[PDB]
Design a protein around this ligand. Structure first.
Ligand SMILES: [Br-]
Ligand SMILES: [Br-]
Ligand SMILES: [Br-]
Ligand SMILES: [Br-]
Ligand SMILES: [Br-]
Length: 149
């Protein structure tokens, strides 16, 4: 099931998914007060009871991302990079409603978010080229998914 599964604590850590094709979770130092097992698994939209409702011009650009523990709340933002097949990040807190995810910090504060971490994050153009989307979030909802429009 799980593409990513690792223990992390206040020192921070990260793990690349086992398919080694862009999926990656970065938990910077101090974002995580107590020891936590961080996970990620991908779900097929049909496994869902309420899939993302799309308008005519909208499609899914990724599989549905389930980050664990569901509902985790970090002390500062964490980074999740997701491969995709305009791109918007949708999230569903408990699986019933879907809304746009917007990082209220965003890409201009990436260095501050990383908090000294010895991790190399590539630019947005470098992510474009690799077809990878970077989600900056301070919590884990039941689902993320990348949507095109
Ligand atoms: Br992976
Ligand atoms: Br990777
Ligand atoms: Br606190
Ligand atoms: Br909805
Ligand atoms: Br954020």
């Amino acid at each position: 099931g799980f593409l990513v599964s690792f223990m992390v604590d206040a020192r921070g850590g990260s793990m690349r998914g086992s398919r080694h094709n862009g999926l990656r979770v970065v938990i910077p130092p101090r974002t995580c007060a107590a020891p936590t097992r961080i996970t990620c698994r991908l779900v097929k939209p049909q496994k869902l009871s309420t899939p993302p409702p799309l308008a005519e011009e909208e499609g899914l650009a990724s599989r549905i991302i389930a980050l664990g523990p569901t509902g985790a709340q970090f002390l500062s933002p964490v980074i999740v990079e997701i491969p995709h097949f305009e791109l918007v990040v949708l999230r569903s807190e408990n699986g019933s409603v879907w809304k746009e995810h917007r990082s209220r910090y965003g890409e201009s504060y990436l260095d501050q978010i990383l908090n000294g971490m010895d991790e190399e994050l590539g630019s947005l153009e470098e992510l474009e080229k690799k077809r990878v989307c970077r989600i900056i979030t301070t919590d884990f909802p039941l689902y993320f998914v990348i949507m095109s429009r």
